[PDB]
Design a protein around this ligand. Structure first.
Ligand SMILES: O=P(O)(O)O[C@H]1[C@H](OP(=O)(O)O)[C@H](OP(=O)(O)O)[C@H](OP(=O)(O)O)[C@@H](OP(=O)(O)O)[C@H]1OP(=O)(O)O
Lengths: 764, 84, 496
DNA sequence: AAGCAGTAGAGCATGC
DNA sequence: GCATGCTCTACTGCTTCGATATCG
């Protein structure tokens, strides 16, 4: 209409009168107008930007919503948002404001050069830990756009574009374990699309190792086998029945199975009672507010316009209060019936028809989908399924590929697996034993890495797998690296019987290593360390100066001997004075040269903590621990692997709260790490079980010293001493590091309860 | 989450742009206190309690070290309203 | 509004052509702008120190803005004036300050006037206070910047429209520019005839140093006629006896305030004594009258606060020598009662006919005894450039009581001969001048301002304000040329 | 002791 | 006998001014 102009200029004249007197009303009126007509905000945009750094409340949310409408019709917008501190308004904790900030970013991304998208990206990737699924969903939307539009469109893009792609890919990988059933499904269908992971199974199996990222290691094997068994669901033999002929002839009815979380099991009923872009999973089936009051034309839905309204506001408020009483009484039910509906809500995957004989006419789906369904839950069965699929697919690679492409498939697989074993920090036992089990089977992967294999299955207690891999590599000049790493694997499970026949003089090793091992076999560790450290400073070798892996073996075994005796001063000196050059030792250099983490760190923490636990007041471990908690990786390493060390350390400064958190973390870490060791790895499970007593003594001490009645008399102390003097590891079977843990922890607990307590001392 | 918010809170106290540091500090305090209030698992609640009442970082040493300053009184007001 | 501050950005064109001034026994335009900015800082630090000021340098190589734009240096944000902000600007003074300026700022760079107006708009945006006026003073000597280009020119005119939409008004302090300053090439359309230096820099170098308060109302009373016809007024003040600001007790080793706390305690037991367990006494020889702290404030309350009209009176009974209190000024406030302005205007232009004045009982505050006060009406005087000197309303003239007057002793009336009166009329006609209203200036207060300036900026010695209330003995003598000796001979006997 | 801007929450309407 | 906003009242901070007590 013609009347556009005289009306929009009238509305703009009233808003122009507003924008200088009351800006609080100017932005409310402008937000309400440009909810519906956005071209009015074009003439007010610099006066919205001017007022934007002034409001801090809901009014800044309204200002940003006015900005959000005109993002495509704005030319620069990054310099204006950067002047107005957009990165710091994104970190304001408000879900509406953060959602509108992320929506502004999403609309202005196809007009950003990489040098400013990289500045915007560092606060965007902080929304992984955001509680709202709406902001996380918007973050995954903009990262999916970055992945689709930054896959090197030209010959060699700059460093900015490459780092942008790397950061987006890291967070997009990390969103495959997202704690929301459907955000994870969006990210999983994003990755399972044909343009990102291929459809060829031999090349999908290679592209799967690109999306590893040490964060997701507990989930990687189930995710990989999910992405691999995607492709069965688009095969022309997938809904076909696997056997076309039944055993005999009988008709089969339809059997529906009652699986509801009310009668979960048969045991909870007494007797008779008074009755007589894509969110889709291929596995579980195939499954603001306005002020205008005028915001269907039928024949049944317009008899509810025959409405009465009680003009008894007192009675109406009484009915609403009684209503809210009923809702408060039903919340008390729902917040228990939903915590019961969480642990007995099972889904069924197959079809289940019943007859007179077993119905051997299952589809291929009725075997594949429960297989992936249980690989998604149990990690051992995911390890076995991934090993089976990887070995089968490389076996069926032989008819396609000839020799020129097979070799640079296996070179890429060797590079990928070396990357896995060199960057894992959570040495997850199914993951480590899976990629050291699929390496034994194929001879082109037997050249994996000797020191990464040794460190991995020493940290995950999976030493038989690494022993089999190293021995098969020594099959097929002596390879002294592999012989020394194999001997380091054998030494940690005991097995000095095997160790005698390794260090003869045909592999090039010295005689001092054999003599020290023969002394260590009879548990004569002081005479073993006496010549280990003697060999570690000797430079006049009359048959060749020793190779480096042998000297690393002497270093590690001498540290083990000092740990085995009790010598905590020599242990901290030997673990500490090899990471620093000068006489002041800088303990924070232990996090570079990744040798230092698996070599010197457990002995460093253990020796300093034992010296703290018996007397000495050198506060040099607490500084290292608090400095290491600043990093997002070092904190994960420390609270995943030690946490009992940490619980005792925080108990030493009377911090019984952080010690509570760390001992509960240690118990959960015990259960997860114990139940993921394969069942026929006995003495791996024995050494995982040997450590539960110290965890529960720390928990029992915390529970004892927390109750105030325990500190009143000497009755509960006498009962605690009466149970501690009957609770021991067994002689002849539990080693001396277990005994030293129990006894040193118990002595420190008794000293703490004594100094807190008011003939008690003779009893303790 | 928390302890990152607390270390950035202690960093926004020796900064050079006062009254520009306090707005960031107030947002750190608000998100921190929101996380501490909305927890119900007694393992992480003891961790968050020990981090809030910590002596290196922590809200009490924040309001102590930010007490010779008028730009930080909204931060101190929000901390004392969180602690109740 | 009222709490709104005044903001001002000094924009100095420190590019290339203010550093090679063509006389060398004169003053370069960079030094002229620096002296001007420093005089405005020293004036506003005690005139109105709640205002906000900033100085930005463009055409300089190094940059310190928030957007990290090319060649914009923001030396200071918008903030209240201080001593250190003048001591930082001291460094770029004189022929040496150029050299002190080059090594840490930059010079001669390319720039964009759009980005410097952008940085000034961002400075006005980052202010959390409320601002009344927002101004940008532009110290420049080149007319037509970006003369090689027109994209820069049209972008600059656009960004000036962006500035004037939000209420920011820039004005240019044009410098010398040998070859005139052509104001029409670039600076007639950007801002709200060849020239020489200016007409604003020179009176901007005149430091005024006099405190200025905003228009508060001091009372909002109701003017009642009997009990029923009440209208609302405001009692403003137009003369108020400016004082010096009071001192602040510091701690000598730190120079920090020290938080005075006064308490009452009895010397018997040394116990802290509340306000409830004291009374107030007066001793008259032997009687002791003992009231309470509540009852001593009951003695004063007579009326309710407001103005009670008590009739009308010709001005001929309002004696000019009946003065005890500086007058106030009433004015109708048409928001506490409606039509107040109409009844005020009818009463005003009807007491403006004759010389009649309303008589009132004035109770300003609550427990305050009344004063009889005379509401003399006054018209308004204005000019064609809408400068008004007298606002319309009444002047509230305080009248003394019987005990506010005092009596004189008996003095003989010794009149003069008309020869003496006619020869003293020549003396008073010789010395005649024009009293404006504000030609004189408080010397004690001025010297306090000068001493505080010189002690906070630690200059070299306190400047002395040239006195003005003092009489000029030699000039009055030479004006009264050879007259006073014959006058005192004709009226005074030849002795002493 | 009162003007004057700024805000926070108390008290209340309302909900069909 | 509850839940959710909305209005608007009452308070604070800052600043000026005036009345009172005190000091060279
Ligand atoms: O006769 P009144 O109207 O009552 O006033 C007269 C007189 O007025 P005139 O000038 O018309 O004679 C003087 O008035 P002012 O000089 O104050 O304007 C006044 O003088 P003082 O108040 O200064 O004393 C005083 O006359 P006097 O000075 O002789 O006392 C007074 O007469 P009353 O003393 O009787 O009031």
């Amino acid at each position: 209409n013609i009347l556009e102009e005289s009306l929009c200029e009238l509305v703009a004249k009233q808003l122009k009168q507003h924008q200088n007197t009351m800006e609080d009303k100017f932005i409310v009126c402008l937000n309400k107008v440009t909810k519906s007509f956005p071209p009015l905000a074009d003439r007010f945009m610099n006066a919205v930007f001017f007022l934007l750094p002034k409001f801090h409340g809901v009014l800044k949310t309204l200002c940003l919503e006015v900005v959000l409408c005109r993002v495509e019709g704005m030319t620069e917008l990054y310099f204006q948002l950067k002047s107005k501190d957009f990165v710091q308004v994104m970190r304001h904790r408000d879900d509406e404001r953060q959602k509108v900030c992320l929506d502004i970013i999403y609309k202005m991304m196809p007009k950003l050069k990489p040098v400013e998208l990289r500045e915007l990206l560092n606060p965007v990737v902080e929304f992984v830990s955001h509680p709202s699924t709406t902001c996380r969903e918007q973050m995954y939307n903009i990262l999916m756009w970055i992945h689709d539009n930054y896959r090197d469109p030209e010959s060699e893009t700059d460093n900015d574009s490459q780092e942008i792609f790397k950061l987006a890919k890291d967070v997009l990988i990390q969103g495959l374990i997202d704690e929301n059933p459907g955000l994870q499904l969006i990210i999983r269908n994003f990755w399972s699309h044909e343009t990102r992971l291929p459809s060829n199974t031999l090349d999908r199996l290679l592209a799967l190792n690109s999306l590893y990222s040490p964060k997701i290691e507990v989930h990687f094997l189930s995710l990989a086998t999910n992405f691999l068994l995607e492709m069965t669901s688009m095969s022309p033999d997938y809904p076909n029945p696997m056997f076309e002929h039944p055993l005999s002839e009988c008709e089969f009815q339809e059997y529906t199975i009652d699986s509801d979380w009310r009668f979960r099991s048969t045991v909870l009923t007494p007797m008779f009672v008074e009755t007589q872009r894509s969110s889709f999973d291929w596995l579980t089936g195939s499954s603001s507010d306005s002020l205008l009051f005028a915001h269907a034309a039928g024949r049944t839905d317009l008899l509810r316009l025959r409405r009465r309204f009680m003009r008894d506001q007192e009675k109406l408020s009484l009915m609403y209060a009684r209503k809210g009483v009923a809702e408060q009484k039903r919340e008390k039910e729902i917040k228990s019936e939903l915590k019961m509906k969480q642990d007995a809500q099972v889904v069924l995957y197959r079809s289940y028809r019943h007859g007179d004989l077993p119905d051997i006419q299952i589809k291929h789906s009725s075997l594949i989908t429960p297989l992936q369904a249980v690989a998604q839950r149990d990690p051992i069965i995911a390890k076995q399924l991934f090993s089976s699929l990887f070995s089968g697919i490389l076996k069926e690679m032989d008819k396609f590929k000839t020799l020129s492409e097979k070799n640079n498939i296996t070179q890429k697989l060797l590079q990928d697996f070396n990357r896995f074993l060199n960057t894992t920090f959570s040495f997850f036992p199914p993951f480590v034993s899976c990629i050291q089990d699929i390496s034994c089977q194929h001879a082109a992967l037997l050249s994996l890495d000797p020191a990464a294999v040794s460190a991995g299955c020493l940290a995950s207690l999976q030493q038989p797998v690494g022993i089999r891999l190293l021995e098969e590599a020594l099959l097929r000049p002596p390879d002294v690296l592999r012989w020394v790493e194999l001997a380091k694997l054998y030494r940690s499970i005991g097995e000095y019987d095997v160790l005698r026949g390794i260090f003869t003089s045909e592999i090039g090793t010295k005689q001092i290593t054999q003599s020290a091992l023969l002394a260590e076999a009879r548990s004569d560790y002081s005479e073993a360390a006496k010549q280990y450290d003697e060999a570690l400073n000797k430079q006049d070798w009359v048959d060749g100066e020793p190779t480096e892996a042998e000297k690393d073996f002497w270093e590690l075994a001498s540290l083990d001997c000092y740990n085995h005796l009790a010598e905590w001063k020599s242990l901290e000196y030997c673990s500490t004075a090899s990471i620093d050059s000068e006489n002041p030792p800088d303990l924070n250099k232990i996090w570079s040269e990744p040798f230092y983490q698996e070599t010197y760190l457990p002995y460093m923490i253990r020796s300093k903590l034992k010296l703290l636990l018996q007397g000495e007041a050198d506060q040099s471990l607490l500084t290292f621990i608090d400095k290491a908690m600043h990093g997002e990786l070092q904190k994960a390493i420390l609270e995943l692997h030690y946490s009992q060390e940490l619980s005792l350390l925080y108990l030493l400064q009377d911090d019984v709260d952080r010690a509570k958190y760390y001992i509960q973390n240690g118990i959960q870490s015990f259960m997860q790490n114990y139940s993921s060791i394969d069942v026929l790895l006995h003495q791996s499970r024995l050494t995982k079980l040997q450590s539960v007593q110290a965890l529960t003594e720390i928990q029992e001490f915390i529970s004892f010293i927390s109750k105030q009645g325990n500190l009143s008399s000497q009755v509960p102390l006498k009962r605690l001493l009466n149970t501690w003097t009957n609770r021991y590891p067994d002689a002849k079977m539990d080693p001396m590091n277990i005994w030293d843990d129990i006894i040193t922890n118990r002595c420190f607990f008794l000293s703490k309860i004594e100094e807190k307590l008011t003939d008690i001392s003779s009893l303790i | 989450g928390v302890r990152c918010s607390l270390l950035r809170l202690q960093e926004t106290l020796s900064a050079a742009d006062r009254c520009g540091a306090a707005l960031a500090g107030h947002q750190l305090i608000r998100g921190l206190g929101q996380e501490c209030v909305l927890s119900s698992s007694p393992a992480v609640l003891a961790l968050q309690t020990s981090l809030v009442f910590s002596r290196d970082f922590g809200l009490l040493v924040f309001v102590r070290k930010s007490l010779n300053s008028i730009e930080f009184r909204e931060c101190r007001e929000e901390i004392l309203k969180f602690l109740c | 509004k009222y709490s709104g501050r005044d903001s001002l950005i000094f924009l100095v064109d420190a590019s290339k052509a203010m550093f090679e001034s063509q006389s060398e026994d004169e003053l370069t335009p960079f030094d002229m702008s620096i002296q001007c900015i420093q005089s405005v800082y020293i004036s506003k630090i005690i005139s109105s120190d709640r205002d906000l000021l900033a100085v930005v340098f463009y055409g300089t190589e190094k940059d310190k803005n928030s957007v990290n734009f090319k060649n914009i240096y923001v030396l200071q944000e918008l903030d209240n004036p201080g001593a250190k902000r003048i001591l930082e600007l001291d460094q770029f003074k004189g022929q040496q300050g150029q050299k002190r300026f080059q090594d840490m700022m930059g010079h001669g760079s390319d720039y964009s006037l759009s980005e410097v107006l952008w940085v000034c708009a961002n400075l006005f945006s980052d202010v959390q206070f409320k601002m009344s006026h927002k101004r940008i003073m532009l110290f420049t000597n080149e007319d037509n910047p970006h003369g090689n280009d027109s994209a820069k020119a049209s972008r600059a005119r656009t960004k000036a429209g962006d500035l004037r939409d939000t209420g920011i008004f820039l004005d240019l302090m044009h410098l010398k520019k040998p070859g005139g300053f052509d104001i029409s090439l670039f600076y007639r359309d950007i801002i709200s005839v060849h020239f020489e230096e200016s007409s604003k820099l020179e009176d901007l170098l005149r430091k005024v140093r006099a405190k200025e308060t905003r228009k508060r109302a001091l009372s909002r009373l109701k003017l009642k006629l009997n009990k029923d016809i009440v209208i609302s007024v405001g009692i403003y003040n137009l003369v108020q006896k400016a004082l010096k600001p009071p001192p602040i007790k510091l701690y000598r080793e730190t120079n920090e305030p020290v938080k005075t706390k006064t308490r009452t305690f009895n010397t018997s037991t040394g116990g802290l004594l509340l306000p409830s367990d004291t009374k107030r006494s007066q001793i008259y020889g032997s009687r002791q009258i003992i009231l309470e702290k509540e009852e001593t404030e009951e003695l004063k309350r007579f009326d309710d606060p407001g103005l009670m009209l008590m009739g009308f009176k010709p001005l001929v009974l309002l004696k000019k020598h009946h003065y005890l209190r500086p007058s106030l000024f009433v004015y109708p406030e048409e928001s506490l009662v409606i039509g107040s302005s109409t009844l005020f205007s009818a009463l005003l232009i009807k007491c403006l006919e004759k010389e009649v004045a309303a008589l009132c009982r004035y109770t300003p505050r609550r427990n305050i005894p009344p004063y009889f006060v005379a509401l003399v009406p006054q018209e308004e005087e204005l000019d064609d450039q809408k400068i008004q000197v007298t606002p319309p309303g009444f002047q509230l003239v305080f009248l003394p009581f019987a005990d506010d007057k005092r009596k004189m002793p008996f003095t003989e009336k010794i009149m003069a001969t008309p020869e003496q009166v006619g020869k003293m009329k020549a003396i008073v006609e010789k010395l005649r001048f024009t009293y404006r209203s504000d030609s004189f200036e408080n010397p004690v207060l001025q010297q306090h301002f000068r001493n505080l300036e010189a002690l906070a900026l630690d200059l070299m010695e306190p400047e002395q304000a040239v006195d003005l209330t003092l009489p000029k003995v030699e000039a009055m003598n030479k004006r009264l040329g050879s007259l006073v000796d014959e006058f005192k001979e004709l009226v005074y006997p030849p002795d002493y």
